[PDB]
Amino acid sequence: AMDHVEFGLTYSQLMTLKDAMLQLDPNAKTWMDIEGRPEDPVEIALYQPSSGCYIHFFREPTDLKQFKQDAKYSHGIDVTDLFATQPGLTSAVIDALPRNMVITCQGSDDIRKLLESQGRKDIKLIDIALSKTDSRKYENAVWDQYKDLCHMHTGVVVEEITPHCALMDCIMFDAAVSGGLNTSVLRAVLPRDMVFRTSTPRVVL
RNA sequence: GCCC
RNA sequence: GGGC
Ligand SMILES: [Zn+2]
Secondary structure: OOOOOOOOOOHHHHHHHHHHHHHOOOOOOEEEEEEEEOOEEEEEEEEEOOOOEEEEEEOOOOOHHHHHHHHHHHHOEOHHHHOOEOOOHHHHHHHHOOOOOEEEEOOOHHHHHHHHHOOOOOOEEEEOOOOOOHHHOOHHHHHHHHHHHOOOEOOOEOOOEOOOOHHHHHHHHHHHHHOOOOOOOOEEOOOHHHHEOOOOOOOOO
8 A cells, every 4th residue: 555654543642541541540351352353343442440540442344344243233332423523543542551451351262363463462351251151141130230330232132132332341241250339330431522523513514 | 144 | 051
């Protein structure tokens, strides 16, 4: 190619991001989960139960055909709802993760591919490797409490089942390991205007 | 339906 | 079996 662009984000936004990420404790238990393929992710979440802090954002898919298919069987995201997303956020957030961080997931193959494709092979991964029943014991309880935190899974998902959300997954997997869900308010690490296009034009031109 |  |  003749295209040579290092970042998707401006330096200003990269600096805001770096500051925001200081809310992450480099040594606290940290869950990570994605929806979409590791080579073409559409939803990313990281969650630290110790503080209630979470990182949550979206990305428009490159493979629209595979996406519409994945939506039917897993995430139920409509692609039009992913238009206002910030390009480059996935790379920027992953680049900003502390060196040699320990990340917990269920399971690890997709997480590993994504992080390694970003040159983070320094990140250590713990796979909880739970069954399909044990990992989703608190599925209803989590959605009951935290549904307002993600409005993106509007499509009917079949195998009809509850849609898979990267954020709800992190919270419910933690609940499974902790043997309970304790009721508490969570805190978004990223500013809203970093995650979505937020401008409202006065007039169309 | 697709991936491991 | 696990995952989208
Ligand atoms: Zn979600």
